[PDB]
Design a protein around this ligand. Structure first.
Ligand code: RIP
Ligand code: CA
Ligand code: CA
Ligand code: CA
Ligand code: CA
Length: 182
């Protein structure tokens, strides 16, 4: 049985190898069990300095979500997160606008909808629009990593053509696709 909560299933992975791109982080996820798990209920993390994978920087980064950490990871030089679950969206057009250091990839219903395939100091990209064909819980996943140094990750989503944006949080997230009453 998987727990039902108003959030995405979060996994954190650390490494002492360099993360240069999405492929490197995905390979890290493939390589071992998560160094920690958590509930991603308010997906607006950071900013901080001095490596997300060192000390208590991950806790600080995750903020409001860190109280659900399964463990306190040890130090690593590089690290990142893999989030998966569901997001309630009505049928229509949407686009992400994401602030991040380093890179990331967000997919909805298996298709990438926001990609930065490289390291970067903090930068905000307004991504291309995508459509949702049927109202309901949509499958969503995210990866994000830090190669070192500073770190931040705030995807925001617009339903109104880029006029307003919102953070993905417990209002609309579901870990399993069932309706959370938590
Ligand atoms: O956080 C930043 C970014 O990772 C950049 O790519 C290299 O410098 C680090 O300090
Ligand atoms: Ca794994
Ligand atoms: Ca730690
Ligand atoms: Ca590094
Ligand atoms: Ca960084």
């Amino acid at each position: 049985p998987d727990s039902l909560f108003a959030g995405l299933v979060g996994e954190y992975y650390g490494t002492n190898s360099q993360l240069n791109n999405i492929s490197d982080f995905r390979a890290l996820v493939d390589s071992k069990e998560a160094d920690a798990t958590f509930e991603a209920a308010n997906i607006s993390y950071g900013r901080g300095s001095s490596d997300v994978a060192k000390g208590t920087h991950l806790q600080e980064f995750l903020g409001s979500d860190a109280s659900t950490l399964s463990t306190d990871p040890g130090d690593n030089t590089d690290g990142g997160i893999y989030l998966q679950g569901y997001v309630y969206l009505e049928a229509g057009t949407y686009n992400f606008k994401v602030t991040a250091d380093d890179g990331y990839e967000i997919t909805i219903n298996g298709n990438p909808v926001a990609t930065v395939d490289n390291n970067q100091s903090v930068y905000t990209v307004t991504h291309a629009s995508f459509t949702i064909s049927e109202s309901g819980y949509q499958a969503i996943d995210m990866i994000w990593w830090d190669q070192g140094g500073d770190y931040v990750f705030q995807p925001t989503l617009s339903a109104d053509g880029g006029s307003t944006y919102f953070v993905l949080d417990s209002a609309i997230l579901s870990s399993t696709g069932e309706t959370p009453y938590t």
